Short mmCIF file of C-alpha atoms and ligand atoms in Angstrom, two decimals:
data_model
loop_
_atom_site.label_atom_id
_atom_site.label_comp_id
_atom_site.label_asym_id
_atom_site.label_seq_id
_atom_site.Cartn_x
_atom_site.Cartn_y
_atom_site.Cartn_z
CA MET V 1 103.94 105.94 85.31
CA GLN V 2 101.70 104.49 82.64
CA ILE V 3 98.45 102.63 82.45
CA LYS V 4 97.93 100.73 79.22
CA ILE V 5 94.11 101.11 78.62
CA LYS V 6 92.10 99.02 76.05
CA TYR V 7 88.40 99.78 75.54
CA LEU V 8 85.79 97.44 74.73
CA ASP V 9 84.91 99.20 71.60
CA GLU V 10 85.00 102.66 69.75
CA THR V 11 81.44 103.71 71.41
CA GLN V 12 82.89 103.60 74.93
CA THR V 13 83.38 107.08 76.21
CA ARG V 14 87.09 107.58 77.14
CA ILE V 15 87.94 107.82 80.98
CA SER V 16 89.61 110.87 82.06
CA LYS V 17 91.56 112.69 84.94
CA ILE V 18 90.17 115.73 86.24
CA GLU V 19 91.72 118.34 88.57
CA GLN V 20 89.50 117.95 91.59
CA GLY V 21 89.37 114.17 91.45
CA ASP V 22 92.05 112.21 93.14
CA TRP V 23 90.50 108.88 91.78
CA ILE V 24 89.37 108.50 88.12
CA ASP V 25 85.80 108.01 87.32
CA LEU V 26 84.77 104.82 85.34
CA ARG V 27 81.60 104.58 83.27
CA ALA V 28 78.87 102.02 82.38
CA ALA V 29 79.71 100.20 79.11
CA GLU V 30 75.96 99.99 78.34
CA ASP V 31 72.46 100.80 79.41
CA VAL V 32 71.61 98.84 82.54
CA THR V 33 68.13 98.50 84.31
CA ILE V 34 68.19 97.00 87.90
CA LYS V 35 65.12 96.14 90.01
CA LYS V 36 64.90 96.73 93.82
CA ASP V 37 66.67 93.91 95.75
CA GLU V 38 68.29 92.75 92.50
CA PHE V 39 71.93 92.16 91.60
CA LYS V 40 73.85 93.11 88.21
CA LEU V 41 77.27 93.28 87.10
CA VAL V 42 77.57 96.68 85.27
CA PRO V 43 80.38 96.44 82.78
CA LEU V 44 82.90 99.27 82.71
CA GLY V 45 84.02 98.64 79.43
CA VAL V 46 87.84 98.74 80.16
CA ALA V 47 90.61 96.39 80.35
CA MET V 48 93.96 97.90 81.87
CA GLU V 49 97.52 96.92 82.41
CA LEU V 50 98.83 98.70 85.46
CA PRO V 51 102.42 99.47 86.23
CA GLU V 52 104.65 96.86 87.39
CA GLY V 53 103.76 96.13 91.12
CA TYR V 54 100.40 97.73 91.36
CA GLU V 55 97.07 96.76 91.91
CA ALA V 56 93.79 98.96 91.44
CA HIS V 57 90.94 99.81 93.70
CA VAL V 58 87.28 100.54 92.81
CA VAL V 59 84.70 102.34 94.97
CA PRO V 60 81.41 104.08 94.37
CA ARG V 61 81.16 107.66 93.82
CA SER V 62 79.70 109.45 96.72
CA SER V 63 76.78 110.43 94.36
CA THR V 64 76.35 106.94 93.18
CA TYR V 65 73.45 106.16 95.51
CA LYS V 66 71.54 109.37 95.07
CA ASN V 67 71.88 109.19 91.34
CA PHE V 68 71.52 105.46 90.91
CA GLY V 69 70.10 103.73 93.94
CA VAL V 70 72.92 101.21 93.98
CA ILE V 71 75.58 100.03 96.38
CA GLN V 72 78.76 98.05 95.62
CA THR V 73 78.22 94.36 97.06
CA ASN V 74 82.11 93.96 97.52
CA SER V 75 82.50 97.33 99.04
CA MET V 76 85.81 98.25 97.59
CA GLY V 77 86.68 96.10 94.64
CA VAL V 78 90.34 94.84 94.38
CA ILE V 79 91.70 94.63 90.74
CA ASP V 80 94.47 92.05 90.72
CA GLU V 81 97.62 93.08 88.97
CA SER V 82 97.33 89.96 86.97
CA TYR V 83 93.77 91.12 85.68
CA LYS V 84 95.32 92.28 82.59
CA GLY V 85 94.35 89.98 79.72
CA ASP V 86 92.70 91.12 76.64
CA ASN V 87 89.36 89.77 77.90
CA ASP V 88 89.72 90.96 81.73
CA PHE V 89 87.20 93.79 81.39
CA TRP V 90 86.50 95.53 84.56
CA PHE V 91 83.05 95.33 86.34
CA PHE V 92 81.07 97.09 89.12
CA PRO V 93 78.93 94.53 91.09
CA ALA V 94 75.69 96.49 91.95
CA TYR V 95 72.73 95.85 94.25
CA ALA V 96 69.86 98.19 93.71
CA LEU V 97 67.98 99.34 97.01
CA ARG V 98 65.32 100.78 94.57
CA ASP V 99 64.24 100.33 90.85
CA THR V 100 66.74 102.13 88.80
CA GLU V 101 68.42 102.65 85.42
CA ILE V 102 72.12 103.58 84.32
CA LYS V 103 73.05 104.98 81.13
CA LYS V 104 75.98 104.26 78.82
CA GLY V 105 78.77 106.65 79.64
CA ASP V 106 77.42 107.43 83.28
CA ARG V 107 80.04 107.74 85.74
CA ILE V 108 79.18 105.34 88.49
CA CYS V 109 82.41 104.57 90.23
CA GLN V 110 86.15 105.58 90.76
CA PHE V 111 89.33 103.98 90.75
CA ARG V 112 93.00 104.46 91.72
CA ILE V 113 96.25 102.50 91.59
CA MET V 114 98.20 101.38 94.68
CA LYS V 115 101.24 99.26 95.34
CA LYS V 116 100.47 95.67 96.16
CA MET V 117 101.40 94.66 99.57
CA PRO V 118 104.90 93.31 100.09
CA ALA V 119 105.85 89.60 100.29
CA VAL V 120 105.25 88.28 103.73
CA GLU V 121 105.99 85.08 105.40
CA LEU V 122 103.11 83.53 107.27
CA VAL V 123 104.82 82.28 110.55
CA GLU V 124 102.46 79.95 112.41
CA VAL V 125 102.74 80.56 116.21
CA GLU V 126 101.23 78.80 119.26
CA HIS V 127 100.90 81.99 121.38
CA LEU V 128 101.16 85.65 120.31
CA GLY V 129 102.12 87.09 123.73
CA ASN V 130 100.58 90.22 123.39
CA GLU V 131 97.73 91.72 125.67
CA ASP V 132 94.33 91.64 123.97
CA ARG V 133 92.97 94.81 122.45
CA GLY V 134 89.46 93.63 121.92
CA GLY V 135 87.26 95.10 119.26
CA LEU V 136 83.73 95.58 117.92
CA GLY V 137 83.28 98.84 119.66
CA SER V 138 85.45 98.14 122.78
CA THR V 139 86.24 101.89 122.90
CA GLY V 140 82.57 102.71 123.14
CA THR V 141 80.73 105.63 121.17
CA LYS V 142 80.74 108.54 123.64
CA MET D 1 108.41 90.67 106.10
CA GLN D 2 106.53 88.34 108.62
CA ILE D 3 103.02 88.04 109.91
CA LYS D 4 102.81 85.75 112.87
CA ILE D 5 99.52 83.92 112.89
CA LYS D 6 97.71 81.74 115.38
CA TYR D 7 94.91 79.67 114.27
CA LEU D 8 91.83 79.23 116.59
CA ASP D 9 92.41 75.22 116.41
CA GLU D 10 93.98 72.68 114.34
CA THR D 11 90.90 72.20 112.20
CA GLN D 12 91.23 75.70 110.53
CA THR D 13 92.37 75.42 106.95
CA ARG D 14 95.65 77.36 106.60
CA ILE D 15 95.27 80.58 104.59
CA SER D 16 97.69 81.04 101.63
CA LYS D 17 98.93 83.37 99.11
CA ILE D 18 98.17 82.63 95.33
CA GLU D 19 99.94 83.92 92.42
CA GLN D 20 97.08 85.76 90.80
CA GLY D 21 95.76 87.26 94.28
CA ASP D 22 97.19 90.58 95.48
CA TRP D 23 95.34 89.98 98.68
CA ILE D 24 95.09 86.77 100.79
CA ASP D 25 91.73 84.82 101.11
CA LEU D 26 90.29 84.51 104.71
CA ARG D 27 88.23 81.64 105.60
CA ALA D 28 85.12 80.72 107.91
CA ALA D 29 86.30 79.25 111.04
CA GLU D 30 82.93 77.23 111.58
CA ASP D 31 79.62 76.55 109.58
CA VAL D 32 77.32 79.73 109.84
CA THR D 33 73.63 80.15 108.73
CA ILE D 34 72.14 83.34 108.39
CA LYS D 35 68.68 84.38 107.51
CA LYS D 36 67.62 87.20 105.19
CA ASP D 37 67.94 90.40 106.93
CA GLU D 38 70.02 89.16 109.93
CA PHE D 39 73.54 90.13 111.18
CA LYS D 40 76.25 87.62 112.06
CA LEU D 41 79.85 87.83 113.08
CA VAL D 42 81.36 85.22 110.70
CA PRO D 43 84.52 84.24 112.81
CA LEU D 44 87.66 83.78 110.54
CA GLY D 45 89.63 81.71 112.94
CA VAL D 46 92.99 83.57 112.91
CA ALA D 47 94.67 86.07 115.29
CA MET D 48 97.68 87.98 113.83
CA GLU D 49 100.79 90.04 114.86
CA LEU D 50 101.46 92.10 111.87
CA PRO D 51 104.84 93.76 111.00
CA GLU D 52 105.53 96.91 112.99
CA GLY D 53 103.80 99.93 111.80
CA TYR D 54 101.18 98.11 109.88
CA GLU D 55 97.43 97.73 109.83
CA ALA D 56 95.35 95.40 107.76
CA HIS D 57 92.24 95.67 105.73
CA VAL D 58 89.57 93.33 105.08
CA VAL D 59 86.96 93.36 102.13
CA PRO D 60 84.58 91.02 100.63
CA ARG D 61 85.70 88.76 97.60
CA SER D 62 84.03 89.95 94.35
CA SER D 63 82.23 86.60 94.40
CA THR D 64 81.08 86.64 98.17
CA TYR D 65 77.67 88.09 97.29
CA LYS D 66 76.93 85.63 94.32
CA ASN D 67 78.22 82.53 96.27
CA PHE D 68 77.07 83.77 99.86
CA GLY D 69 74.35 86.44 99.59
CA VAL D 70 76.13 88.63 102.27
CA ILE D 71 77.53 92.24 102.46
CA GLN D 72 80.09 93.42 104.87
CA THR D 73 78.39 96.10 107.06
CA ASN D 74 81.60 97.94 107.86
CA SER D 75 82.37 97.98 104.28
CA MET D 76 86.29 97.71 104.77
CA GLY D 77 87.36 96.36 107.91
CA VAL D 78 90.50 97.85 109.48
CA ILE D 79 92.42 95.52 111.65
CA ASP D 80 94.34 97.77 114.01
CA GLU D 81 98.01 96.90 114.66
CA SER D 82 97.15 96.56 118.54
CA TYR D 83 94.64 93.82 117.80
CA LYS D 84 97.32 91.39 117.98
CA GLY D 85 96.31 89.62 121.34
CA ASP D 86 96.01 85.81 122.01
CA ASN D 87 92.16 86.30 122.00
CA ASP D 88 91.93 88.86 119.34
CA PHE D 89 90.58 86.59 116.47
CA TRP D 90 89.34 88.26 113.31
CA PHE D 91 85.85 88.27 112.17
CA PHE D 92 83.86 89.33 109.01
CA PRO D 93 80.52 91.17 109.84
CA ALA D 94 77.87 89.99 107.56
CA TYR D 95 74.44 91.20 106.79
CA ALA D 96 72.40 88.50 104.77
CA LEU D 97 70.54 89.87 101.69
CA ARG D 98 69.03 86.17 101.43
CA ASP D 99 68.98 82.88 103.43
CA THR D 100 72.52 81.67 103.29
CA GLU D 101 74.67 79.01 104.75
CA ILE D 102 78.63 79.18 104.95
CA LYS D 103 80.92 76.35 105.59
CA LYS D 104 83.86 75.98 107.73
CA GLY D 105 86.84 76.63 105.44
CA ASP D 106 84.87 78.69 102.83
CA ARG D 107 86.83 81.59 101.46
CA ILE D 108 84.42 84.52 101.98
CA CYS D 109 86.88 87.62 102.19
CA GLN D 110 90.44 88.80 101.62
CA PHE D 111 93.06 91.01 103.34
CA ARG D 112 96.24 92.89 102.86
CA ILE D 113 98.41 94.70 105.13
CA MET D 114 99.45 98.33 104.69
CA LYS D 115 101.54 101.13 106.58
CA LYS D 116 99.43 102.95 109.28
CA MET D 117 99.14 106.71 108.41
CA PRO D 118 101.87 108.82 109.84
CA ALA D 119 101.70 110.56 113.23
CA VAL D 120 99.52 113.89 112.40
CA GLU D 121 99.12 116.93 114.32
CA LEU D 122 95.73 118.38 114.45
CA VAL D 123 95.77 122.09 114.22
CA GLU D 124 92.71 124.03 114.67
CA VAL D 125 91.91 126.89 112.52
CA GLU D 126 89.14 129.45 112.25
CA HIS D 127 89.52 129.63 108.47
CA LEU D 128 90.95 127.31 106.12
CA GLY D 129 91.67 129.93 103.39
CA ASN D 130 90.81 127.84 100.43
CA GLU D 131 88.26 127.95 97.65
CA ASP D 132 85.32 125.31 98.02
CA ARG D 133 85.50 122.31 95.98
CA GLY D 134 81.90 121.16 96.64
CA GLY D 135 80.98 117.60 96.69
CA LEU D 136 78.53 114.76 96.46
CA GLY D 137 78.21 114.62 92.62
CA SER D 138 79.40 118.28 92.07
CA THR D 139 80.98 116.99 89.00
CA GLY D 140 77.93 115.38 87.36
CA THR D 141 77.12 112.10 85.89
CA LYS D 142 77.92 112.40 82.22
CA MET G 1 102.73 116.01 109.58
CA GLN G 2 99.84 118.44 110.16
CA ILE G 3 96.11 118.47 109.22
CA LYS G 4 94.24 121.83 109.60
CA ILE G 5 90.83 121.19 111.15
CA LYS G 6 87.93 123.58 111.13
CA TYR G 7 85.03 122.62 113.37
CA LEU G 8 81.39 123.56 112.19
CA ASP G 9 80.93 125.51 115.47
CA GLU G 10 82.05 125.57 119.34
CA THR G 11 79.84 122.74 120.29
CA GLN G 12 81.44 119.94 118.23
CA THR G 13 83.23 117.42 120.54
CA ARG G 14 86.79 117.60 119.18
CA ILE G 15 88.24 114.53 117.51
CA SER G 16 91.43 112.81 118.74
CA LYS G 17 93.92 110.14 118.19
CA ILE G 18 93.64 107.26 120.53
CA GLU G 19 96.39 104.57 121.34
CA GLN G 20 94.76 101.49 119.90
CA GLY G 21 93.08 103.30 117.10
CA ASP G 22 94.93 103.32 113.82
CA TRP G 23 92.34 105.47 112.13
CA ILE G 24 90.67 108.49 113.80
CA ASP G 25 86.97 108.35 114.88
CA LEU G 26 84.74 111.06 113.32
CA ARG G 27 81.53 112.38 114.89
CA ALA G 28 77.83 113.20 114.23
CA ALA G 29 77.60 117.06 114.22
CA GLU G 30 73.86 116.96 115.44
CA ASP G 31 71.26 114.36 116.55
CA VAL G 32 70.01 112.24 113.42
CA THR G 33 66.94 110.07 113.43
CA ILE G 34 66.66 107.58 110.25
CA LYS G 35 63.85 105.24 109.79
CA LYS G 36 64.48 101.78 108.42
CA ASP G 37 65.23 101.97 104.69
CA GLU G 38 65.78 105.68 104.72
CA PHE G 39 68.88 107.51 103.43
CA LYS G 40 70.41 110.52 105.39
CA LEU G 41 73.78 112.44 104.99
CA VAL G 42 75.12 112.52 108.44
CA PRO G 43 77.18 115.68 108.97
CA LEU G 44 80.45 115.08 110.69
CA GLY G 45 80.97 118.76 111.63
CA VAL G 46 84.57 118.99 110.23
CA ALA G 47 86.31 120.48 107.28
CA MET G 48 90.02 119.83 106.61
CA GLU G 49 93.19 120.80 104.90
CA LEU G 50 95.41 117.73 104.56
CA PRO G 51 99.07 117.76 103.96
CA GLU G 52 100.20 118.39 100.40
CA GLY G 53 99.64 115.31 98.16
CA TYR G 54 97.23 113.41 100.51
CA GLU G 55 93.87 112.30 100.26
CA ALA G 56 91.71 110.82 103.17
CA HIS G 57 89.54 107.74 103.35
CA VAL G 58 86.40 107.26 105.61
CA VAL G 59 84.83 104.02 106.40
CA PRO G 60 82.53 102.98 109.25
CA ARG G 61 83.73 101.50 112.57
CA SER G 62 83.03 97.87 113.17
CA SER G 63 80.44 98.55 115.75
CA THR G 64 78.48 101.22 113.53
CA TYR G 65 75.88 98.50 112.58
CA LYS G 66 75.54 96.94 116.07
CA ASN G 67 75.11 100.35 117.59
CA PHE G 68 73.39 102.39 114.94
CA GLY G 69 71.84 100.10 112.37
CA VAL G 70 73.35 101.82 109.35
CA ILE G 71 75.66 101.10 106.28
CA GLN G 72 77.75 103.46 104.36
CA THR G 73 76.32 103.89 100.86
CA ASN G 74 79.62 104.43 99.05
CA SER G 75 81.45 101.97 101.20
CA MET G 76 84.63 103.74 101.57
CA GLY G 77 84.34 107.50 101.17
CA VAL G 78 87.32 109.43 99.39
CA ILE G 79 88.11 112.77 100.46
CA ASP G 80 89.70 114.57 97.78
CA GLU G 81 92.79 116.77 98.51
CA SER G 82 90.94 119.68 96.89
CA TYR G 83 87.99 119.48 99.28
CA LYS G 84 89.56 121.87 101.86
CA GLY G 85 87.52 124.96 101.42
CA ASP G 86 85.84 126.65 104.24
CA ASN G 87 82.39 125.13 103.48
CA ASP G 88 83.65 121.78 102.54
CA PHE G 89 82.29 119.89 105.44
CA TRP G 90 82.63 116.10 105.59
CA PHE G 91 79.77 113.83 105.66
CA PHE G 92 78.80 110.11 106.19
CA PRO G 93 76.24 108.91 103.72
CA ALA G 94 74.04 106.54 105.87
CA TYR G 95 71.34 104.00 104.83
CA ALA G 96 69.36 102.59 107.78
CA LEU G 97 68.71 98.82 107.89
CA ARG G 98 66.55 99.24 111.13
CA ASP G 99 65.10 102.34 112.99
CA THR G 100 67.72 104.27 114.59
CA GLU G 101 68.79 107.43 116.39
CA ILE G 102 72.27 108.81 116.03
CA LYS G 103 73.27 111.36 118.87
CA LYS G 104 75.19 114.46 118.65
CA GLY G 105 79.09 113.77 119.18
CA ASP G 106 78.63 109.94 118.63
CA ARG G 107 81.50 108.23 116.97
CA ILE G 108 80.18 106.68 113.94
CA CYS G 109 83.05 106.17 111.40
CA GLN G 110 86.92 106.55 111.12
CA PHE G 111 89.34 108.05 108.71
CA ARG G 112 92.86 108.16 107.69
CA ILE G 113 95.10 109.98 105.26
CA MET G 114 97.00 108.44 102.37
CA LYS G 115 99.28 109.68 99.70
CA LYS G 116 97.36 109.95 96.50
CA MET G 117 98.03 107.84 93.63
CA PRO G 118 100.78 109.42 91.50
CA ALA G 119 100.37 110.99 88.08
CA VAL G 120 99.49 108.46 85.34
CA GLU G 121 99.84 108.56 81.70
CA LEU G 122 96.70 106.72 80.09
CA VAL G 123 98.12 104.88 77.08
CA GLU G 124 95.45 103.69 74.82
CA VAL G 125 96.30 100.31 73.35
CA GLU G 126 94.34 98.02 70.92
CA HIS G 127 95.68 94.84 72.37
CA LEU G 128 96.95 94.18 75.88
CA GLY G 129 99.10 91.18 74.98
CA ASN G 130 98.70 89.30 78.36
CA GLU G 131 97.06 85.99 79.33
CA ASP G 132 93.44 86.44 80.78
CA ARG G 133 93.18 85.95 84.60
CA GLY G 134 89.38 85.84 84.77
CA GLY G 135 87.66 86.93 87.94
CA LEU G 136 84.33 87.02 89.78
CA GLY G 137 85.14 83.87 91.86
CA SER G 138 87.38 82.17 89.30
CA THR G 139 89.55 80.56 92.08
CA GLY G 140 86.34 78.99 93.69
CA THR G 141 85.52 78.99 97.06
CA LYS G 142 87.02 75.96 98.70
O1 DUR Z 1 84.81 95.11 91.68
C1 DUR Z 1 85.58 94.38 91.07
C2 DUR Z 1 86.24 93.38 91.70
C3 DUR Z 1 87.01 92.34 90.79
N1 DUR Z 1 87.08 92.71 89.49
C4 DUR Z 1 87.85 91.69 88.70
C5 DUR Z 1 89.43 92.00 88.71
C6 DUR Z 1 89.86 91.10 89.86
O2 DUR Z 1 91.18 90.71 89.81
C7 DUR Z 1 88.87 89.82 89.59
C8 DUR Z 1 88.70 89.06 91.01
O3 DUR Z 1 88.47 89.88 92.09
O4 DUR Z 1 87.70 90.47 89.21
C9 DUR Z 1 86.42 93.76 88.88
O5 DUR Z 1 86.44 93.87 87.70
N2 DUR Z 1 85.67 94.57 89.67
O1 DUR Z 2 85.98 93.91 109.90
C1 DUR Z 2 86.53 93.79 110.99
C2 DUR Z 2 86.83 94.99 111.61
C3 DUR Z 2 87.41 94.95 112.95
N1 DUR Z 2 87.83 93.77 113.58
C4 DUR Z 2 88.59 93.81 114.70
C5 DUR Z 2 89.92 94.25 114.65
C6 DUR Z 2 89.98 95.68 114.93
O2 DUR Z 2 91.21 96.40 115.33
C7 DUR Z 2 88.93 95.71 116.02
C8 DUR Z 2 88.18 97.14 116.25
O3 DUR Z 2 87.43 97.56 114.95
O4 DUR Z 2 87.92 94.69 115.69
C9 DUR Z 2 87.73 92.59 112.79
O5 DUR Z 2 87.93 91.57 113.11
N2 DUR Z 2 86.97 92.60 111.64
O1 DUR Z 3 81.99 109.93 102.25
C1 DUR Z 3 82.21 111.02 101.77
C2 DUR Z 3 82.56 111.05 100.51
C3 DUR Z 3 82.94 112.16 99.96
N1 DUR Z 3 82.88 113.37 100.63
C4 DUR Z 3 83.18 114.73 100.17
C5 DUR Z 3 84.74 114.92 99.89
C6 DUR Z 3 84.74 114.44 98.42
O2 DUR Z 3 86.05 114.93 97.83
C7 DUR Z 3 83.57 115.19 97.83
C8 DUR Z 3 83.39 114.67 96.51
O3 DUR Z 3 83.24 113.38 96.73
O4 DUR Z 3 82.63 114.85 98.80
C9 DUR Z 3 82.42 113.32 102.19
O5 DUR Z 3 82.38 114.21 102.81
N2 DUR Z 3 82.14 111.86 102.54
MG1 MG Z 4 84.15 112.46 92.20
MG1 MG Z 5 90.15 86.78 94.57
MG1 MG Z 6 87.71 101.77 116.58
#
């Protein structure tokens, strides 16, 4: 399969697949300063057209917190297939838990493609007729 | 395929598939108020029986933090296939990063379904026999 | 399918598939204390070789926060297929929101395996030629 990738400009550092990386690292399109308890969209400088039928998912690197002090407010980002216009540039929504700086080209998150869920009819029912599982720690911790 | 959905009551807004959303938006089942640094189960007012062999995942919308100042504490919720009882209503577990108010019907997160992982045998070994990859930023930042 | 699992030592409680659990719970390899607003890598006392072509994903349990007052800094951990060396032990990167103790053997997160994304050719293009979707809450909230 092919992903069509359009960079914001000639100064973006191209993204790349590496051997031991199952997902592909994305990079801050510019220097970004964030304060403790402050929010900021970090631009990733990339617009993409994914193969037919695929969405993309975006998560932090596991070193993102150590190196950059931020977490991703939407936890795992969902890039909709339809987000493929010439101006639909990808972003990483960041919340700083400490004062931090990010540099241009810094690998701060990673992505992969995956097939969209199938089409599914929503059948409204009065009663489900299954026994309750329960949740929220119903199985304990020990 | 079909999902059977049971709404908590007749005042819940029905969830809906939109053409530019690969995931489906879920909605607060009642008004919720949350103070900075407090936790609240935001009830989503729906219980579901998913197609056989599937689980679901629930993540925030990208605008959730902006519009509502919350994060999802479990990051990506996993709705187990067995949580298909008549009382197994879904919830979004929110930590507030600021005083916030959520209204009944507000689209605060999104879901999709996916095949469960296959049945796996867990084979204990004394030695894995492979070279170490290392981790936690072993590949650097640049 | 088979997963080869190597425990850190003979005192680790063995992990298991439970009926109502679509993912499998992972456990703390030792007692860990974390003060509010501290970070700590919680060791899970396991290394694994996954079936050929698979990665694994690691997220918290819904009850992780209720029971242990932590969130997962990288939101959803991606365990690369290559991370299968004899010293490649899994970890849960935890940030404490309140003062907590995590006890040895406690089930603090869950994992599953998944087919990696297939091989993708990155095709550099100057214009994507599609209509802009927009994002970051473009569909509103109501
Ligand atoms: O982390 C994210 C989440 C979303 N989006 C874009 C693409 C997606 O279709 C749209 C709405 O979520 O915003 C991003 O660039 N990054
Ligand atoms: O974010 C979540 C996570 C879990 N659950 C329910 C369904 C799941 O099977 C059960 C145990 O985690 O709790 C939710 O409603 N929302
Ligand atoms: O939450 C995580 C995230 C990553 N890793 C390991 C495996 C992964 O391939 C390596 C590089 O991220 O770190 C973990 O053990 N836990
Ligand atoms: Mg990496
Ligand atoms: Mg959306
Ligand atoms: Mg569970």
